[PDB]
């Protein structure tokens, strides 16, 4: 715990495009890595205001902050100081697709996150492009080792302003930059909340709690 302290800050930069609309976001976060809690404030720096739902971006802003039982190795914490990378595909139920690539490193005592995101094929009348979503329900991520990396699968659900839910099938691969002890399969319960936003979602605060279990 000379590397990952009980309190850690992070900085994040995202470049993205959704249905061809380019944007950039810069953010600052902090949290308690061993307790599985964190917050962040994100600001749209280019392309604002965004003409689509913030909710598709919120899960791209930190798996060093997952509470783990003592008998499950914390693969992503152990990847530091070098860090780890992750890539993700989210297949939404109406054909929209989000692809993400991310690098996580440790610089001068803070985590540094760099993200690229592409969203495509969202229907112009759908809840993403019409901003009719209302946050994520609690998620269960199934973690499993495969092919030398740590993988996760989620059946993720967005609440709809008009009622019901909008589903995404999510697959992620997380890989330490140096060889690290891979854990056996386990589950992570995640809850991400938007705790504040201005009217056009150009400044947004998030909170996330994440805990692994057998």
């Amino acid at each position, epitope marked *: 715990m000379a590397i990952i302290k009980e309190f850690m800050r992070f900085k994040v930069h995202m470049e993205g495009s959704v249905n061809g609309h380019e944007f950039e976001i810069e953010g600052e976060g902090e949290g308690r890595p061993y307790e599985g809690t964190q917050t962040a404030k994100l600001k749209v720096t280019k392309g604002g205001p965004l003409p689509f739902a913030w909710d598709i971006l919120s899960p791209q802003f930190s798996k060093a902050y997952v509470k783990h039982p003592a008998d499950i190795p914390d693969y992503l914490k152990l990847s530091f100081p070098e860090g780890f990378k992750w*890539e993700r595909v989210m297949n939404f139920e109406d054909g929209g697709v989000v692809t993400v690539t991310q690098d996580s490193s440790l610089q001068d005592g803070e985590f540094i996150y760099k993200v690229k995101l592409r969203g495509t094929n969202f229907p112009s009348d759908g809840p993403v492009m019409q901003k009719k979503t209302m946050g994520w329900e609690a998620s269960s991520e199934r973690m499993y080792p495969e092919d030398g990396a740590l993988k996760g699968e989620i059946k993720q659900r967005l609440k709809l302003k008009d009622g019901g839910h909008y589903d995404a099938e999510v697959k992620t691969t997380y890989k330490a930059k140096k060889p690290v002890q891979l854990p056996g399969a386990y589950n992570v319960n995640i809850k991400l909340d938007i705790t504040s936003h201005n009217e056009d979602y150009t400044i947004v605060e998030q909170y996330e709690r994440a805990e692994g279990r057998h």
Partner: nanobody
Amino acid sequence: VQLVESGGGLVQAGGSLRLSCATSGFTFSDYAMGWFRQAPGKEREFVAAISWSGHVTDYADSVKGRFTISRDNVKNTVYLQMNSLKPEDTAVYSCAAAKSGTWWYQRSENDFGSWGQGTQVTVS
């Protein structure tokens, strides 16, 4: 660093074949990989590329839906499955490893390196 392609050949239109690229000398999962093709007299052109995890793929419009790029991060191999082949697909197909390792939908010859010598595909 070292890439060697195989799996080409001569097939009828409507056929299906699969190219593979063996690799050596680098950490395979540190690199995006790409397939390019070169027909007589034309410029070497982008076919498909795949990120380190396999989750992010990109295809030339001419082959989308007919070809699939994939990779095996244990065997350290890249594949190009080629279905619904047309005479216009005839070319030498070569594989390359990306510039840096963080790659993002980059299709230029110049963003890739460490080219293999390629494998001939001829469709009649």
